[PDB]
Structures are given as structure tokens and as C-alpha cells.
Design a protein around this ligand. Structure first.
Ligand SMILES: *CCC(=O)N1CCC[C@@H](n2nc(-c3cn(-c4ccc(C(C)=O)cc4)nn3)c3c(N)ncnc32)C1
Length: 265
């Protein structure tokens, strides 16, 4: 559907002029619905833009509109189609995990990465089983969080060893090591090919053992960083890992932690 906004459970007859532009975020606009006061994220696709960009934007929007039943994927509130533009209203999140790392200026606690791991794995498992989509780029910039504790996947250096000669599991492990240590494991590489050489030649950058990380966390990262892809576990096997099982039920106040980090300059 187009020309309608669905915030919560109320559908609103809306047009693009019913939204107030509050500025650009990081092209995704922050806009306010004048009829209710809701602030939403709006992605603008110009019909005169690049054909390559508009091709993938329409492709992911197809998946986004099909992912209304997944609580770990950014939801679409509606679309506005004009004679020159396509505005995609999206659920407004707080910030991405990469900004949280830079704002923290240090490692992100394991309990936060535990809830983050459960959310991201279930999002990737949803894209594969129900949509046949394999998200070929999982990184902290694609992991979104808000002030209510939600952790969702955004869009659809981290390439798996076999993707060069499943593959997304390797990208999640690299992201977990980067957030758990505050250091990108391939930060000393100048070119993209130098990162490539170290992934195949060097041992997997595992989690350090002197930071109080639980054995379940280090085991989950080691399983994600398996160089031989034939021995890398499935999402079916990952979802039963004790690290996933712990944070599927453990109460972690991600909302309060998110506010505390955002309250720093
Ligand atoms: C670290 C991440 C970061 O800084 N960002 C860049 C600036 C915008 C930030 N941000 N993105 C979203 C967002 C984007 N999408 C999205 C929807 C559809 C498609 C396609 C290709 O169809 C692509 C992206 N959904 N959500 C944000 C939201 N929703 N809230 C807050 N900030 C957001 C990411």
C-alpha cells in the first residue's frame, strides 16, 4: 500500500506534505507526522537518481514489507509515491552499534552483546527460512538500537573465507569481537585486500581470555569464526548454543544502558 502511515495499530491517510523535515540522519530523513506528532525515519528515493541504487532500494523494500512478522528487523510504516520521488517511512531507531562503540570509547558489555546476538541471529534465520535471503554484510553499522531496548537489523572486512574462493555467521563473529574489545580485529590493514589476506592466512581473531568473558560467549564467537565453512554451524545449530539460550530469557536492561551511553559527549 501507499499513501498511508501505520504507527502502532492506527492507519492514517497521509501524504508527503503531512510530514515535517527535521533534518538528515547520517539519505534517510528524520521527519515528524504533523497529524499525530510521531517522529519517523523517511528514506527518499529520487526517480532521477542512480539506477543501481534505486534497483537495490526497491529490492530491500520488498523484503522489508515482507518482514512485518519479524521483531528483529526495522519495520516499514508506509510509502509515499510522488511523480518524482518515493518516500519510505521507517521505524525510527536511536543509533547504530558502530556509533554506540564510538560513543562508549571502549568495549560494549557482554550482556548487551548477548541480547544483540539473539536479535541478529534470529533476524538472519528469518531472512533465510521465510524469504530465502542471505544478508551478505553483517556489521555494527547494520545493527540498530533505540532507547526502548530494541535491537533490530537495518539493511540487507567481514567477508567469510569461503565467500572469497554460513557466510553471514563469520560477519557476525567479527562484529562481536569488534564490539566486545572496542577494536576492529583488522584495523592495521590499509587496503581491502590486506584484510582479505589476513582472514585466510592468519588464525581467527578470537575473543581475549582476560576480560571476564563467559565461556559461552567465547564459544559462540569461536563457532562463528570457523575458517572452514563446511564446519561452520547453521542457524539451526547456532540458535541452540548456550550463549543464545542464556540471553533468550535473561532480563537485560538494554534501554537504560542505551540512555546512559547516549548521555555522554
Ligand atoms: C551506524 C548506522 C548509521 O549511522 N546510519 C546511517 C544514517 C541513518 C541511520 N539509520 N538508518 C535507518 C534505517 C534505514 N533503513 C532502511 C530501509 C530500507 C532500505 C532499503 C535499501 O530498502 C535501507 C535502509 N531502515 N532504517 C534508521 C532508523 N530507522 N532509525 C534511526 N536511524 C537510522 C543508519
Amino acid at each position: 500500500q501507499t499513501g498511508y502511515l501505520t504507527i502502532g495499530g492506527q492507519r492514517y491517510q497521509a501524504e508527503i506534505n503531512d510530514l515535517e523535515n527535521l533534518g538528515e540522519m547520517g539519505q534517510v530523513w528524520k521527519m515528524r507526522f504533523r497529524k499525530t506528532g510521531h517522529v519517523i525515519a523517511v528514506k527518499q528515493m529520487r526517480r532521477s537518481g542512480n539506477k543501481e541504487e534505486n534497483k537495490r532500494i526497491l529490492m530491500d523494500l520488498d523484503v522489508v514489507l515482507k518482514s512485518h512478522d519479524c521483531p528483529y528487523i526495522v519495520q516499514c510504516f508506509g510509502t509515499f509515491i510522488t511523480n518524482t520521488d518515493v518516500f519510505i517511512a521507517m521505524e525510527l531507531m536511536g543509533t547504530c552499534a558502530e556509533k554506540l562503540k564510538k560513543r562508549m570509547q571502549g568495549p560494549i558489555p557482554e550482556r548487551i552483546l548477548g541480547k544483540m546476538t539473539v536479535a541478529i541471529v534470529k533476524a538472519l534465520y528469518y531472512l533465510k527460512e521465510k524469504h530465502g535471503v542471505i544478508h551478505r554484510d553483517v556489521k555494527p553499522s547494520n545493527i540498530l538500537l533505540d532507547e526502548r531496548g530494541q535491537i533490530k537489523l537495518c539493511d540487507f572486512a567481514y567477508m567469510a573465507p569461503e565467500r572469497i574462493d554460513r557466510a553471514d555467521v563469520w560477519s557476525l563473529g567479527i562484529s562481536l569481537v569488534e564490539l566486545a574489545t572496542g577494536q576492529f580485529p583488522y584495523k592495521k590493514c590499509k587496503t581491502d585486500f590486506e584484510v582479505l589476506t589476513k582472514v585466510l592466512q592468519e588464525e581467527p581473531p578470537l575473543l581475549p581470555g582476560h576480560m571476564g568473558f563467559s565461556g559461552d560467549f567465547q564459544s559462540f564467537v569461536k563457532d562463528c569464526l570457523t575458517k572452514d565453512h563446511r564446519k561452520r554451524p547453521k542457524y539451526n545449530k547456532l540458535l541452540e548454543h548456550s550463549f543464545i539460550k542464556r540471553y533468550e530469557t535473561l532480563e537485560v536492561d538494554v534501554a537504560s544502558w542505551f540512555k546512559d551511553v547516549m548521555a555522554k559527549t
